[PDB]
Design a protein around this ligand. Structure first.
Ligand SMILES: CC(=O)N[C@H]1[C@H](O[C@H]2C[C@@H](C(=O)NCCS(=O)(=O)O)[NH2+][C@@H]2CO)O[C@H](CO)[C@@H](OS(=O)(=O)O)[C@@H]1O
Ligand SMILES: [Zn+2]
Ligand SMILES: [Zn+2]
Length: 277
């Protein structure tokens, strides 16, 4: 690994190059049929990544910065693509919510509060920090192995541990690829690896990625609880829809629960701070 400071990080031309700089899993990848299968899916469903990237442009700078600070694999900045298509309103059949697809119980473990009007799993900053912590902890639990960490993120640490124990007793290898996991978990890791290979060298697959500037999109500003999204949008001449996309924790755009804080476009943050005083 290497590190870059705040100063150096500014010099990347776009977010894709910045993300690629911190990839940590590429050298470990081999020719697996499981990876190829997932790579084919991305090529034959090209609108998927394009739509994910357009939505993700709101959030990717923040995610990348958090990953860099913790020296975690920047391939994880693509995990919300796989999990939610970078749609923080996505809700799975298991009730997994937000960019990072926390189920209620795991959300509660990380103190992501769920009321009738606020879901901290959808909250961009809270859910991101919780997801990275969970992934780091899982990685540490499986002796530094990011593949097993990812598998446990999807299937639970118990499932993965039991699969390891089961293979050990049979005298079989205990690496991710050899574990008899649920099919969703079997596909999970190769999906991320496949996607990361395309992001690393998109030309080689006949793909073009939407350029995304290497700049912050939003800034947090304090807002007291008696102020709705519409009023904030009016005050700073913001698009209310974009503001909702930046603050998806608030169900029906109701801001009565949760933190006294909104993410707002960087360019308006100073004015809003001053006007709310
Ligand atoms: C981040 C998160 O909440 N991860 C949890 C994961 O969610 C998974 C579930 C999956 C999901 O929603 N699957 C259904 C998809 S579909 O609706 O059928 O398409 N997506 C989430 C993140 O990968 O499910 C397992 C098992 O329950 C949990 O482990 S356990 O608590 O030890 O059991 C684990 O904590
Ligand atoms: Zn270091
Ligand atoms: Zn570098």
């Amino acid at each position: 690994h290497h590190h870059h400071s705040s100063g150096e990080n500014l010099y990347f031309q776009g977010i894709w190059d910045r993300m690629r700089d911190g990839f940590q899993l590429q050298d470990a990848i081999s020719t697996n049929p499981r990876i190829e299968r997932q790579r084919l899916w991305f090529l034959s469903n090209q609108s998927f990544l394009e739509q994910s990237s357009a939505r993700g442009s709101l959030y990717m700078h923040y995610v990348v910065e958090r990953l860099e600070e913790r020296n975690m694999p920047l391939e994880l900045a693509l995990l919300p693509v796989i999990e939610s298509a970078y749609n923080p309103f996505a809700l799975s059949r298991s009730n997994a919510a937000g960019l990072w697809q926390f189920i209620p119980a795991t959300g509660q473990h990380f103190n992501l509060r769920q009321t009738n009007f606020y879901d901290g799993r959808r909250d961009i900053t809270a859910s991101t920090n919780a997801a990275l912590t969970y992934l780091e902890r899982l990685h540490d639990m499986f002796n530094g192995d990011w593949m097993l960490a990812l598998a446990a993120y999807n299937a639970g640490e118990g499932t993965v541990s039991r699969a390891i124990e089961r293979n050990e007793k049979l005298g079989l290898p205990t690496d991710y690829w050899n574990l008899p996991l649920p099919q969703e978990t079997q596909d999970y890791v190769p999906k991320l690896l496949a996607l990361s290979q395309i992001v690393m060298a998109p030309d080689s697959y006949g793909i073009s990625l939407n350029p995304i500037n290497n700049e912050p999109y939003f800034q947090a500003v304090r807002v007291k609880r008696g102020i709705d999204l519409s009023s904030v949008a009016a005050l700073a001449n913001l698009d209310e829809d974009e503001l909702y996309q930046l603050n998806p924790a608030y169900k029906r755009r109701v801001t009565m629960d949760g933190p006294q804080q909104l993410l707002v476009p960087m360019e308006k943050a100073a004015f809003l701070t001053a006007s709310l005083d």
